[PDB]
Every structure is written in C-alpha cells, then in structure tokens.
DNA sequence: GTCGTTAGTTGTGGGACTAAAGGATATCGTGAACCGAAAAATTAGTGTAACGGGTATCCCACAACGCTAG
C-alpha cells in the first residue's frame, strides 16, 4: 500500500465583528435567541447539532 | 476573429432598530325553493285500612322493709 504524508491546512487570522461572532457560536440555542432564528435552526437541523 | 475568465460594479433581497408602564377600538355588498333532521311538547294510563298473636324498641313511674315469735 502506497501512502503520502498528510497536508496540514493553512489559514490566516481574521478580525470578525461582534454580531457575526455571536451568530457563529457553537451553541445553537444561544445563536437562535439573538438573531436570524430561522437560519440558525435550519443549519442546526440539517447538521444535527 | 472568437470564446471562457476575472474583477468590479449594479440591482435586488433578507435582517437589525434600550429599558419601565399600558393595552379601549370596527369590521358592506343577499338568490330561491324544497327536503331532511332532530329536538321539543302533548297526551294516555293506575288508586287502601285494620286486623290475630308475638315481640323489638321508646317514655314514665315505682321499688330495692323492719320487727316478733317458734
């Protein structure tokens, strides 16, 4: 079996606004109670969070 | 000359907009006629009184002694 070394992802630091950071929290209950409830609940249901 | 690509618009669509109290509204337009459904009202029909013993209970009153002789 021939294998190759795994390639690590590359990324850059990014400054995010407070609204986007609040809306991108790992808890869908917290995000759904701030803004865009339909969108957060949709993504949470499709992804099964 | 011609076809796919990339970046910068441009128009269009979806999503935010303190906290406390309070918190009353007015709401058109009309086509007919018959049948069925069930909910309601009206009508038609039958009846006791004391007695025998014997005994369960009630109220209501009274008793539940003292002395002498063989």
UniProtKB/TrEMBL annotation:
Portion of the full-length sequence here: 1335 to 1383 of 1432
Superkingdom as given in the UniProt entry: Bacteria
Family recorded in the similarity comment: Belongs to the RNA polymerase beta' chain family.
Subunit: The RNAP catalytic core consists of 2 alpha, 1 beta, 1 beta' and 1 omega subunit. When a sigma factor is associated with the core the holoenzyme is formed, which can initiate transcription.
Organism (species): Flagellimonas taeanensis
General function of this protein: DNA-dependent RNA polymerase catalyzes the transcription of DNA into RNA using the four ribonucleoside triphosphates as substrates.
Name assigned to this protein: DNA-directed RNA polymerase subunit beta'
